[PDB]
């Protein structure tokens, strides 16, 4: 019961910046993690339920995860892109409940293109 929504990437130059956004809906409660992952499908940035930030050793310093609670979305800020950053860039949440039960949402992915 989580609906993920994509947005925002595109071309930038060598150096320059993007935000991708995630927006969550549903059941919001039962989300321990969402992140964006690239392609293996490796992960890029990771965000907790309780805020805690991870990021692939790639990306550290030049990428920021973020969170608007408000408005569930979880914000990609990509900055100092490499041209190996291209990619179609994912988003992931992943539930865990009280029974047991565990579920991973996948939103459709979003094209990063770093070049000239």
């Known amino acids: 019961q989580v609906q993920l929504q994509e947005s925002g990437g595109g071309l930038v130059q060598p150096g320059g910046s993007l935000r991708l956004s995630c927006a969550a809906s549903g059941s919001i409660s039962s989300i321990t993690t969402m992140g964006w992952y690239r392609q293996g499908r490796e992960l890029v940035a990771l965000?907790?339920?309780?805020?805690?930030?991870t990021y692939a050793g790639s990306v550290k310093g030049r990428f920021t995860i973020s969170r608007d609670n408000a408005k569930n979305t979880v914000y990609l800020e990509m900055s100092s892109l490499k041209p190996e950053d291209t990619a179609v860039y994912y988003c992931?949440?992943?539930?865990?409940?009280?029974?047991?039960?565990?579920?991973?949402?996948w939103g459709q992915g979003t094209q990063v293109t770093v070049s000239s």
């Open positions: 992931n949440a992943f539930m865990s409940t009280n029974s047991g039960r565990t579920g991973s949402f």
């Open positions: 965000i907790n339920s309780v805020g805690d930030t």
